[PDB]
Design a protein around this ligand. Structure first.
Ligand SMILES: [Mg+2]
Ligand SMILES: [Mg+2]
Ligand SMILES: [Mg+2]
Ligand SMILES: [Mg+2]
Ligand SMILES: [Mg+2]
Ligand SMILES: [Mg+2]
Ligand SMILES: [Mg+2]
Ligand SMILES: [Mg+2]
Ligand SMILES: [Mg+2]
Ligand code: NA
Ligand code: NA
Lengths: 189, 152, 178, 66, 49
RNA sequence: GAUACUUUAAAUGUGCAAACAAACCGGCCUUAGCCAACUGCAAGGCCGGAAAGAAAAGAAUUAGAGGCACCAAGUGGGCCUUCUUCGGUAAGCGGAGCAGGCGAUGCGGAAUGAACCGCUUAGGGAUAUGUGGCGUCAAAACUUAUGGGCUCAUUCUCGAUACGUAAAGGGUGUUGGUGGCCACCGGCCCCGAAAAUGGAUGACGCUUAAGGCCAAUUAGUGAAUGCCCAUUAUUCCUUUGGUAAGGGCGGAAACGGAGAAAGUGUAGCCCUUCCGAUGUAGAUGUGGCCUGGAGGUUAGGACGAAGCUUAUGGCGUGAGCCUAAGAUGGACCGGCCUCUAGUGCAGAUCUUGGUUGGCGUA
RNA sequence: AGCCAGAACCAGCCCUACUGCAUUAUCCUGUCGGGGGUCAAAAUCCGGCGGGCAACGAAGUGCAAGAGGGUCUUGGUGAAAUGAGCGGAGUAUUUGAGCUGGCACGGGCACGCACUCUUCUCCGUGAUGCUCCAUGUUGGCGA
């Protein structure tokens, strides 16, 4: 399915360019968000939003839907986060290497498909590739899959950052860096 | 500190709008209020009998009592760590019917109509599509966006 | 070595609506370190010239324009910059380089050194290669001379990183320490 | 000597949260309402209680029958 | 990183690895790139006419 | 108006609602409620129906268990900062609004600093980072680059880490820009610039910078991370506590080793698993430690009790407990379960006794 | 086997190895005319139309999937080694790339949806073991 989708998009772009028109990309549906500041001197409103996003510790990461209520929530905490649009390789790496489940209240590492099937009790989520597909394509069970997991706890980026206190556009780090979030996360996972 | 009366600091709150003075109208008189209705409490500065305190001037509540000329309303008010339910008594000139539930009532009505049509077997309307999808754009005008000498 | 700014073309429009079912499409040329900065500059230009916000807009295309073959040419660069005291000031300056991106990077460094002007306070109006007979400044014209030749004097030559030493014998090449 | 400020007060008030109001269906007393309607409602409620007692007796008899 | 864990979680990964090695093979890449360029330029030239 | 009062009118706010004691659709009962009357309206109930249990249109999210009591401590001198501000000529001055801090708190940076920057704390390894750095002091470019400009300053003196401790006006000193060899506008530098012990970019020093603006990562070769430093992040080992989560506990048989308690708390009944751990005033817990005496029980002592001494080790996170030696002593006393109190000392110009430097001095 | 060393192997973890697809056009190349300049003619530069891939490291454009070194940063030497890695059986299986025969996509199909090259495949050990501890090799020192 993935390979076919990519090929179809390539053909559509070629057909537009041949006659000199333009092809509009679909707006992104999924965002990946990581926290880049520690827990000190935070206002009550920002504190509440970060708690609701489950980002309670520096270098915690989550996946969210990129719709209007979520975007307006994300805009209010911009100095604290770095976010962007993930790729399939990034989603696979996060699930396979840093993925844990909420089982009985505990944080349990994923080690086989049987525990995934037992946690979810759904015929559409029985394996790690099912989880990957739901997260990547923003399918019907996006909330079920993401709510079922513990937030991702990542390491600091090897090689360093640029400037915590400035926006990415000003040569800093915080805010929306679009597809370039994948290079950032490859050094943290 | 020195002066704190019932109507202190209401110079702009209890005043009529520009070129809109006068007294309530027959539409206000002929409005029916039942127990259990949602109402807005808005003070009418030209009446002066049965006027609420300035705290309640923009709040919405539930009617709990109707008298020959008055209405009793329940309004939430936070005090220190809790929310109290205060009962205020006003004249009927100072309330309006609230439209805070129009969308919910409309949603229930549309659901009933859809159920009726689905049971009848009538054809359903075509569902709307998303505006965030892709497509090919055929342009009519293309321009050049630039900063020029004359701009400054 | 290589220039620190790339050349981008960004094409965009406002999202269609019942008021404007077919919006106008605009093309923009910018020099930026990456495409995110390029898109930021595009949306700023759209906001200040066409009253279109990024929150109601579509970006149709965003690519990097390739450089030509490396050849030594003269580049005229029309640029503008802001400061609080003077205000907004417009300059036209000639540079010697081998590519458009190289000339524009030169111009940015030059403005930073001689006027303390930073990237986000600068707009590039135009840049193009001009022939040899339109050069006005003699400091640039001197490089057209067909008999140009000069020696290298006062050189600071360092050894290869593997062969550097701290103490060496005075008239020889032997290293005593390191 | 006579200082006044509200500096820490909102922080204090939010530790155990601002509690929400009691739901509308609890503590719904009618005392102080317009008297004639109250007097009529009382008579209706008395008749309703009589009817409830009769209905229970009929149910018990029916179950005893079968 | 692990061979056993990766295969346990995704039993299909060996086929993907086979496809990867095939695509990295030099002769396959040369033929594929050469043929692909001819396939594209020819199709564009035909369609634009 | 006078010579700021106001039609208009934001940003940031603020009240209510968004299907399970609720609301929608039709029988019926009752009312000494309204209406000329009721088959209308109001109210309380009973019998039935429906129920994407809330679609599609960007069409929420949650380290999201709701409610209700009882008993009681400390506190009621605050102070600093950000953005608004009122008084005051001004103040490290007085008075307020919103939020964050210190007080009650260290750690890593800014040479130094309650409050700035980073980060917030069980006992330890490894890896990687933040703020800040990479001439020596001092870890890191053993003074990196196969990057571009600019700058020369003679008794406080070029300059060089924010918060934090000099103006008008001049200058052909040097580097560029606009318009017409001129007039104006810039960048660095120089005059303008005068105090009280000898002295401060932190010191030395630095000028093909070790300065100021911009930009890189081994360099027009051809592909994401130059390097160094935390009580932070990831991970591994051990402790402790949970609103903790699972499993075993009828001795399988035979004969490598032992053990195997139905359990709040222990030398924890035994395994496995997950998450938290700093703190002044203050609260509470502890098969938590120690002292004098009573009721029981179990022991010791002239082959040496109590007391005392210690480069006597061992055990315990700790309060402490136990052994060894006495080239010490000479008659009483240890453990465990209950009971009981005149029951634990470093400081109160504390009480009483004894010592002591000044001092072989005045 | 007590103490102190060195090397090997196994599990785990941590580093460095091995990498393809899209996009190039404001580009590449040949002529014609102009303009330029020299002691003459070339080039920088502009406009006509002929072709096109700058393709050995061509882009420093977007997204990428591809066993050698440590563990005095861990545990062990097979006292139930779950392994694509230890064992049994054969030689085929099915992953991609080229090339193949209704609907979709654009004003033909670059090759979406349905029905020759390139790689290893299938099968296996429950705990009448609830818990703990007891298992290599080579020297130095200790008679
Ligand atoms: Mg940094
Ligand atoms: Mg800040
Ligand atoms: Mg105090
Ligand atoms: Mg602090
Ligand atoms: Mg050093
Ligand atoms: Mg435990
Ligand atoms: Mg504590
Ligand atoms: Mg006492
Ligand atoms: Mg004492
Ligand atoms: Na210093
Ligand atoms: Na006593």
């Amino acid at each position: 399915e993935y390979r076919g989708a990519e090929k179809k998009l390539v053909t559509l772009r070629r057909q537009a360019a041949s006659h000199g028109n333009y092809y509009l990309e679909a707006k992104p549906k999924v965002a990946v968000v990581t926290r880049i500041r520690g827990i000190a001197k935070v206002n009550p409103k920002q504190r509440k939003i970060l708690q609701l996003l489950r980002l309670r510790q520096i270098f915690n990461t989550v996946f969210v839907k990129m719709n209007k209520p979520m975007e307006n929530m994300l805009r209010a905490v911009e100095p604290y986060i770095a976010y962007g649009y993930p790729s399939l390789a990034t989603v696979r790496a996060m699930v396979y290497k840093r993925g844990y489940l909420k089982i009985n209240g505990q944080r349990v590492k994923i080690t086989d498909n049987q525990m995934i099937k037992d946690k979810y009790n759904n015929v559409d989520i029985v394996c790690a590739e099912d989880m990957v597909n739901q997260i990547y394509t923003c399918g019907k069970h996006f909330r079920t899959v993401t709510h079922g997991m513990w937030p991702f706890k990542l390491a600091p980026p090897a090689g360093g950052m640029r400037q915590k206190r400035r926006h990415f556009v000003e040569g800093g780090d915080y805010g929306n860096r679009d597809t370039l979030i994948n290079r950032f996360l490859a050094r943290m996972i | 500190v020195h002066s704190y009366g019932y109507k202190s600091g209401t110079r702009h709150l209890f005043a009529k709008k520009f070129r809109k003075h006068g007294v309530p109208s027959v539409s206000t008189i002929l409005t029916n209020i039942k127990v259990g209705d949602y109402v807005d409490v808005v003070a009418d500065s030209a009446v002066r009998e049965g006027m609420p305190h300035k705290y309640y001037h923009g709040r919405t509540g539930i009617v709990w009592n109707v008298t020959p000329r008055g209405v009793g309303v329940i309004i939430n008010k936070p005090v220190r760590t809790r929310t109290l339910r205060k009962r205020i008594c006003v004249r009927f000139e100072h309330v309006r019917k609230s439209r805070c539930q129009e969308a919910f009532k409309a949603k229930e009505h549309q659901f009933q109509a859809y159920l009726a049509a689905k049971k009848a077997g009538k054809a359903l309307p075509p569902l709307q599509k998303s505006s965030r999808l892709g497509g090919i754009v055929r342009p009519k005008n293309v321009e050049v966006l630039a900063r020029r000498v004359a701009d400054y | 070595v290589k220039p620190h700014l790339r050349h981008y073309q960004v094409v965009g429009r406002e999202s269609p609506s019942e008021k404007n079912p077919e919006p106008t499409v605009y093309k923009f040329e910018v020099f930026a370190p990456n495409f995110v900065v390029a898109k930021s500059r595009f949306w700023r230009m759209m906001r200040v010239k066409n009253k279109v916000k990024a929150t109601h807009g579509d970006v149709l295309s965003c690519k990097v324009v390739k450089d030509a073959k490396l050849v030594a040419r003269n580049y005229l660069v029309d640029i503008a910059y802001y400061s609080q005291r003077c205000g907004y000031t417009r300059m036209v300056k000639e540079f010697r380089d081998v590519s458009k991106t190289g000339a524009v990077s030169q111009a940015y460094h030059d403005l930073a050194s001689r006027h303390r002007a930073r990237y986000h306070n600068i707009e590039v109006l135009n840049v193009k290669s001009i022939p040899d007979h339109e050069v006005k400044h003699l400091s640039i014209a001197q490089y057209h001379a067909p008999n140009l030749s000069f020696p290298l004097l006062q050189r600071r030559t360092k050894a290869t990183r593997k062969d550097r030493a701290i103490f060496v014998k005075k008239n020889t090449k032997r290293a005593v320490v390191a | 000597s006579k200082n006044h400020t509200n500096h820490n007060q909102s922080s204090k008030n939010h530790r155990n949260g601002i509690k929400g109001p009691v739901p509308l269906h609890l503590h719904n007393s009618k005392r102080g309402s317009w008297l004639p309607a109250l007097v009529n409602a009382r008579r209706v409620r008395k008749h309703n209680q009589k009817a409830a007692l009769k209905k229970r007796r009929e149910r018990i008899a029916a179950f005893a029958a079968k | 990183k692990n061979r056993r864990l990766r295969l346990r979680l995704n039993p299909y990964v060996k086929r993907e690895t086979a496809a990867a090695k095939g695509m990295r093979n030099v002769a396959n890449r040369d033929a594929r790139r050469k043929a692909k360029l001819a396939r594209v330029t020819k199709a564009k030239k035909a369609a634009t006419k």
